[PDB]
Design a protein around this nucleic acid. Sequence first.
DNA 1: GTCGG
DNA 2: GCTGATGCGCA
DNA 3: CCGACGGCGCATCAGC
Length: 325
Amino acid sequence: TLNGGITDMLTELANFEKNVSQAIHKYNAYRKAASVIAKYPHKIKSGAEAKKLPGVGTKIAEKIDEFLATGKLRKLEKIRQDDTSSSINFLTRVSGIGPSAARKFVDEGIKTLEDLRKNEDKLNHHQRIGLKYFGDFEKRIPREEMLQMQDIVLNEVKKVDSEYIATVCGSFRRGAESSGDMDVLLTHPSFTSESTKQPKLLHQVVEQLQKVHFITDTLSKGETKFMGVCQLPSKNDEKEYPHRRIDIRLIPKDQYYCGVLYFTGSDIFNKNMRAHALEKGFTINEYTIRPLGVTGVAGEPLPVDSEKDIFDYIQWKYREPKDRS
DNA sequence: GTCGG
DNA sequence: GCTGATGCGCA
DNA sequence: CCGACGGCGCATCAGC
Ligand SMILES: [Cl-]
Ligand SMILES: [Cl-]
Ligand code: NA
Ligand code: NA
Ligand code: NA
Ligand code: NA
């Protein structure tokens, strides 16, 4: 909205650094800059003004000045006019094709989707699936569909064993009106960090979701993490639903609620909570909450039976998922 | 590229 | 065949 | 001035 020219420009620069230059820290720098600018409540009028924001430095300020003056950036013009840079950047839009493979493909004249289709023998399993659902994977998922996907997963999980707990996390859990993908955290009383009393806990859930044809493809699967593809059922009269990315993570019960907290977010919420935790004095990561001794040494993980427990340890008023943004 | 020891 | 490294996508 | 900047599970490759 406000400053959309600027954040688009910074996002384009971010993608170039990640995909072409293979410079992940500059990607994140541009991304951090675009994000802070996006949340600034005035239309930026100079590079100097932008520089007051954390994560906007000297070089980005100069680019903002150039963009405000000219309505474009010469650096991006050049980048866009270079066949190699734009093709590499484009190929990375395929799931399974990262900066390294995009460069390899382009070096041998594989530059477009059509080129990829003709050379499917040069693609791995993940890449073929990314190619197959290229368009579908770029569509967001409206909340109404997420709600419908939730019913199917929570239902099928219950059917395999009543004692599984499954929670759909992400922005969705915070009430978002659309999601990028579905992230499901799964646990079971038999699975703890102490020992595994029962094998194939994840596999039986994945298998059941395949049985009812909700899961259609597998990008990867091991003991603790599944990554794949799913699709809502449609009516015979009606248009088919897009295929969607689904991840399911099996987490030990004693770490489950720290997991839910972490994977619910937001990033900025987690960040603030971790800092306030640190001065109370606890350390919170994805897995545990541990007290810090006088010397700054973490002790043993504390017992967590719910998300609220974590909030209590650091004497923080519980915040419902939709208030974490 | 930006930041903080 | 084995082990460790790298690519990939992911809060 | 100089190194940090999430870091982890799985698939696949490199190097034996
Ligand atoms: Cl970098
Ligand atoms: Cl831990
Ligand atoms: Na700044
Ligand atoms: Na990609
Ligand atoms: Na820092
Ligand atoms: Na080999």
